[PDB]
């Protein structure tokens, strides 16, 4: 990923807010030199992505994790809101399209996590916390978790580098920008909100 200056994160906390808000991530590694990816829920331990630790799990029948000893460099991609920008919105002739989006790329070394039960219980709490009501596992469900454990492989990524893209049209002048934002406000309110947050000076 390459990040033009206009699409850099405005504030250092924005990468971590995106990661926490979008836990269904893409875990990418090199299996015999070719890329392989698994969609998995991944949570963040720590205040910042860079230097932080990611915790995830996948199916033990998914052979992807068997590579995590011989090829330990991994990339985890977290994806926020996104949307196509049609030249129709600009209302200018000569124009060209683009796609607006925010994403965080965390690269580091992967390792298997012995305490798989901890990883999945922490994932439950993190993903249920924004919901009302939140689901809290009963004793019967924690016992069920224990019965399920042979089928899971948990893992940790110690994040060495992070890269964040907030490609949200901030290069546009106000008239073309207003038109982009108004088009997303109707059909993609999450993206419009991200655009609003990208313009903040402090909060």
Among 41, 72, 83, 190, binds ligand HEM (CB under 6 A): 41
User: Contacts with ligand HEM: how many residues (CB under 6 A)?
Assistant: 22
The phi-psi region of residue 169 (left if phi > 0; otherwise alpha if psi is between -120 and 50; otherwise beta) is: left
Give the contact letters, 113-152, x = binds to a copy of itself (CB under 8 A), - = no.
Answer: -------x---x--xx--x-x-x-xx-xx-xxx--x----
**Are the C-beta atoms of 54 and 45 separated by less than 8 Å?**
yes
Candidate ranges 67-75, 107-115, 142-150, 186-194; the one touching ligand HEM (CB under 6 A):
142-150
Tell me if 33 contacts a copy of itself by CB under 8 A: yes
Among 9, 18, 25, 40, binds ligand HEM (CB under 6 A): 40
Tell me if 66 contacts a copy of itself by CB under 8 A: no
Candidate ranges 9-17, 44-52, 69-77, 174-182; the one touching a copy of itself (CB under 8 A):
69-77
Looking at the chain, which runs of residues are DSSP E strands? 24-31, 34-45, 53-59, 73-85, 98-112, 152-167
Binding positions for ligand HEM, 56-95, rule CB under 6 A: 57-59, 62, 84
Residues 6+ positions from 90 with CB-CB distance below 8 Å: 176, 179, 180
**Are the C-beta atoms of 104 and 3 separated by less than 8 Å?**
no
How many Cβ atoms from other residues are within 10 Å of residue 180's Cβ?
Answer: 22
Q: Look at strands 53-59 and 152-167 and give their pairing.
A: antiparallel
* Rounded distance between C-alpha atoms, residue 1 and residue 28, angstroms: 14
Q: Which residues bind a copy of itself (CB under 8 A)?
A: 1-2, 4, 24, 26, 28-30, 33-39, 41, 59, 61-64, 71-75, 77, 79, 82, 84, 86-88, 93-97, 99, 101, 103, 105, 107, 120, 124, 127-128, 131, 133, 135, 137-138, 140-141, 143-145, 148, 165
């Amino acid at each position: 990923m390459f990040v033009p200056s206009y699409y850099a994160a405005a504030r250092p906390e924005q990468a971590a807010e995106l990661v926490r808000s979008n836990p269904f991530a893409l875990v990418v590694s090199a299996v015999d030199g070719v890329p392989v990816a698994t969609h998995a829920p991944v949570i963040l331990e720590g205040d910042a992505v860079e230097g932080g630790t990611l915790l995830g799990h996948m199916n033990r029948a998914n052979p992807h994790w068997r590579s995590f000893a011989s090829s330990p460099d991994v990339l985890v991609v977290f994806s926020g809101p996104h949307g196509y920008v049609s030249p129709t919105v600009y209302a200018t002739d000569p124009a060209a399209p683009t796609w607006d989006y925010a994403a965080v790329h965390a690269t580091g070394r992967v390792e298997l996590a012995e305490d798989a039960l901890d990883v999945v219980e922490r994932t439950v709490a993190a993903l249920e916390a924004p919901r009302d009501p939140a689901w809290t596992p009963t004793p019967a469900s924690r016992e069920y978790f224990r019965a399920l454990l042979p089928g899971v492989v948990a893992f940790r990524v110690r994040v060495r580098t992070e890269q964040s893209m907030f490609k949200l049209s901030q290069d546009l002048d106000a008239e073309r920008y207003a038109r982009v934002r108004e088009a997303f406000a109707a059909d993609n309110p999450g993206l419009a909100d991200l655009m609003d947050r990208s313009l903040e000076h402090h909060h």
